[PDB]
Design an enzyme around this catalytic site. Structure first.
Site, PDB file in Angstrom:
ATOM      1  N   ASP A  16      -5.644 -14.159   2.583  1.00 13.62           N
ATOM      2  CA  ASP A  16      -4.492 -13.758   2.663  1.00 13.62           C
ATOM      3  C   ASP A  16      -3.661 -14.673   3.811  1.00 13.62           C
ATOM      4  OD1 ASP A  16      -2.535 -10.910   2.015  1.00 13.62           O
ATOM      5  OD2 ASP A  16      -1.808 -13.266   1.844  1.00 13.62           O
ATOM      6  N   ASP A  32      -0.101 -17.353  -1.951  1.00 11.58           N
ATOM      7  CA  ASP A  32      -0.873 -17.183  -0.644  1.00 11.58           C
ATOM      8  C   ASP A  32      -2.088 -16.565  -0.578  1.00 11.58           C
ATOM      9  OD1 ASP A  32       0.022 -14.630  -0.602  1.00 11.58           O
ATOM     10  OD2 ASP A  32       0.302 -14.890   1.680  1.00 11.58           O
ATOM     11  N   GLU A  33      -2.720 -16.270  -1.655  1.00 11.37           N
ATOM     12  CA  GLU A  33      -4.014 -15.414  -1.523  1.00 11.37           C
ATOM     13  C   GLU A  33      -4.990 -15.801  -2.476  1.00 11.37           C
ATOM     14  OE1 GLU A  33      -2.443 -11.187  -3.727  1.00 11.37           O
ATOM     15  OE2 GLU A  33      -2.482 -11.361  -1.688  1.00 11.37           O
TER      16      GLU A  33
HETATM   17  N1  LIG Z   1      11.427 -13.694  -3.194  1.00 14.13           N
HETATM   18  C1  LIG Z   1      10.431 -12.942  -2.750  1.00 14.13           C
HETATM   19  N2  LIG Z   1       9.365 -13.320  -2.244  1.00 14.13           N
HETATM   20  C2  LIG Z   1       8.289 -12.691  -1.820  1.00 14.13           C
HETATM   21  C3  LIG Z   1       8.582 -11.233  -1.902  1.00 14.13           C
HETATM   22  N3  LIG Z   1       7.281 -10.735  -1.297  1.00 14.13           N
HETATM   23  C4  LIG Z   1       6.623 -11.728  -0.882  1.00 14.13           C
HETATM   24  N4  LIG Z   1       7.256 -12.954  -1.290  1.00 14.13           N
HETATM   25  C5  LIG Z   1       6.768 -14.273  -1.333  1.00 14.13           C
HETATM   26  C6  LIG Z   1       7.118 -15.180  -0.063  1.00 14.13           C
HETATM   27  C7  LIG Z   1       6.087 -14.605   1.183  1.00 14.13           C
HETATM   28  O1  LIG Z   1       6.113 -15.479   2.174  1.00 14.13           O
HETATM   29  C8  LIG Z   1       4.953 -14.242   0.227  1.00 14.13           C
HETATM   30  C9  LIG Z   1       4.146 -13.203   1.256  1.00 14.13           C
HETATM   31  O2  LIG Z   1       2.881 -12.737   0.507  1.00 14.13           O
HETATM   32  P1  LIG Z   1       2.525 -11.318   1.220  1.00 14.13           P
HETATM   33  O3  LIG Z   1       3.794 -10.400   1.059  1.00 14.13           O
HETATM   34  O4  LIG Z   1       1.441 -10.863   0.654  1.00 14.13           O
HETATM   35  O5  LIG Z   1       2.440 -11.428   2.868  1.00 14.13           O
HETATM   36  P2  LIG Z   1       3.565 -12.487   3.877  1.00 14.13           P
HETATM   37  O6  LIG Z   1       2.985 -13.460   3.575  1.00 14.13           O
HETATM   38  O7  LIG Z   1       4.802 -11.637   3.496  1.00 14.13           O
HETATM   39  O8  LIG Z   1       3.167 -11.628   5.352  1.00 14.13           O
HETATM   40  P3  LIG Z   1       1.702 -10.666   5.403  1.00 14.13           P
HETATM   41  O9  LIG Z   1       0.634 -10.730   4.141  1.00 14.13           O
HETATM   42  O10 LIG Z   1       2.405  -9.264   5.281  1.00 14.13           O
HETATM   43  O11 LIG Z   1       0.999 -10.953   6.607  1.00 14.13           O
HETATM   44  O12 LIG Z   1       5.064 -14.175  -0.912  1.00 14.13           O
HETATM   45  C10 LIG Z   1       9.795 -10.754  -2.354  1.00 14.13           C
HETATM   46  O13 LIG Z   1       9.891  -9.469  -2.224  1.00 14.13           O
HETATM   47  N5  LIG Z   1      10.743 -11.472  -2.769  1.00 14.13           N
HETATM   48 CA   LIG Z   2      -0.505 -12.175  -0.215  1.00 15.81          CA
HETATM   49 CA   LIG Z   3       0.364 -12.824   3.116  1.00 14.24          CA
END
Ligand SMILES: Nc1nc2c(ncn2[C@H]2C[C@H](O)[C@@H](COP(=O)(O)OP(=O)(O)OP(=O)(O)O)O2)c(=O)[nH]1
Ligand SMILES: [Ca+2]
Ligand SMILES: [Ca+2]
Ligand SMILES: [Ca+2]
Ligand SMILES: [Ca+2]
Length: 343
Positions: free
Chosen positions: A9, A107-108
């Site tokens: 991830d 992303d995973e």
């Molecule tokens: N438009 C939109 N995109 C999202 C949302 N949540 C996630 N994404 C998309 C863009 C984020 O960069 C990507 C994030 O994947 P993840 O939520 O599993 O982790 P992120 O990459 O946010 O950081 P992390 O996994 O918590 O370390 O997916 C959302 O609520 N709305």
């Molecule tokens: Ca993810």
């Molecule tokens: Ca992520």
DNA sequence: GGGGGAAGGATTCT
DNA sequence: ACGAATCCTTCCCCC
């Protein structure tokens, strides 16, 4: 003896990419936003780096609220296409560590390294080799999860995030099945978490004291069998390729409306972009999706005995839109389309 | 009874 | 206060 799954991830993905592309941002609070155009900063946060999430700014909150909190952070418009291409390249590399790779999202991914390693030590080492390689090649940190099945691999990463790597051995799996809050099980959101409490189930294990049919009656059979499996430490879905089964675009209107002529331009814009994205794919099904003013969602669709041309999609989408306005009195806020059942 | 499939809505998740 | 998969329920055609 059993499966060895390695989950990957990428950390705060969208924002980290903005950093990679402009390293002068590192250390600063970065907020990737989805600007709806309704007014100055209407919209929500797609994601934010950790320097910003430690103050409460994260995926989901309105852009206006994030600015209330971090008025001086850096706010960037989401650039979906850019992150996707960066994502593809990173998926290709992982691909070099297993044939059985399941790309779960942008992303995973899960890798089945059952016959590439023996026991968890080597697994653990294959993790670093991967982290280190993605870091070197793309300068993107990622968290790695390793366990006997996809679900626990996933859980392993959630616990190590960010920039971490973790293993959850069969022995520990047996603890989690007792200690892990059912709510933290992947695929269990608020709606299910609360139905589960009402039935006295707060930990995976609990799903063994309840009569099966009651579970099924309360949260569906698919979800019941799922939890009972993990609970019985018997879950074993194989890692497997997954191809896109749908493509669509949905947009927010400057003003809510019920006037067919005000909505059409947005709907047609949605069809355009969607078709462009379909690429060489031909859908047999089309759905018009509308988000009503009270952020509710209504949809109307139709499946054709053959593929759908753009002209056919234009025409049919307008009829489905008319169906909506007719069967639903609320004002429409967001309008779009989704194509599927690819030939 | 069952099978088959199609709509539309519910949930989840990132 | 912004793209997509899986599943559930109902309705329908029919042997
Ligand atoms: N438009 C939109 N995109 C999202 C949302 N949540 C996630 N994404 C998309 C863009 C984020 O960069 C990507 C994030 O994947 P993840 O939520 O599993 O982790 P992120 O990459 O946010 O950081 P992390 O996994 O918590 O370390 O997916 C959302 O609520 N709305
Ligand atoms: Ca993810
Ligand atoms: Ca992520
Ligand atoms: Ca949850
Ligand atoms: Ca997420």
């Amino acid at each position: 003896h059993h499966m060895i799954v390695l989950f990957v991830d990428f950390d705060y993905f969208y924002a980290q990419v903005e950093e990679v592309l402009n390293p002068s941002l590192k250390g600063k609070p970065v907020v990737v936003c989805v600007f709806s155009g309704r007014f100055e900063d209407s919209g929500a946060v797609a994601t934010a780096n950790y320097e910003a999430r430690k103050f409460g700014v994260k995926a989901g909150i309105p852009i206006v609220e994030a600015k209330k909190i971090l008025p001086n952070a850096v706010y960037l418009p989401m650039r979906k296409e850019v992150y996707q291409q960066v994502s593809s390249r990173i998926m290709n590399l992982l691909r070099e560590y297993s044939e059985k790779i399941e790309i779960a999202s942008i992303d995973e991914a899960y890798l089945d390294i059952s016959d590439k390693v023996r026991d968890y030590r080597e697994a653990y080492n294959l993790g670093l080799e991967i982290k280190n390689k993605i870091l070197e090649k793309e300068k993107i940190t990622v968290t790695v999860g390793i366990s006997k099945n996809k679900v626990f691999a996933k859980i392993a990463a959630d616990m190590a995030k960010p920039n971490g790597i973790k293993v959850i051995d069969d022995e520990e799996v047996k603890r989690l099945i007792r200690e892990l809050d059912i709510a933290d099980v992947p695929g269990i959101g608020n709606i299910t978490a609360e139905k589960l409490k009402k039935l006295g189930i707060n930990k995976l294990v609990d799903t063994l004291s309840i009569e099966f049919d009651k579970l099924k009656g309360m949260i569906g059979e698919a979800k019941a069998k799922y939890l009972i499996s993990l609970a019985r430490d018997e879950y074993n879905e194989p890692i497997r390729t997954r191809v896109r089964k749908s493509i669509g675009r949905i947009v927010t209107m400057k003003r809510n409306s019920r006037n067919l002529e005000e909505i059409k331009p947005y709907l047609f814009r949605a069809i355009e972009e969607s078709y462009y994205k379909l690429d060489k794919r031909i859908p047999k099904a089309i759905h018009v999706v509308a988000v009503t003013e009270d952020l509710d969602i209504v949809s109307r669709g139709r499946t054709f005995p053959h593929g759908i041309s753009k002209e056919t999609a234009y025409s049919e989408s307008v009829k489905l839109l008319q169906k909506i306005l007719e069967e639903d009195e609320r004002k429409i806020r967001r309008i779009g389309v989704r194509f599927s059942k690819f030939i």
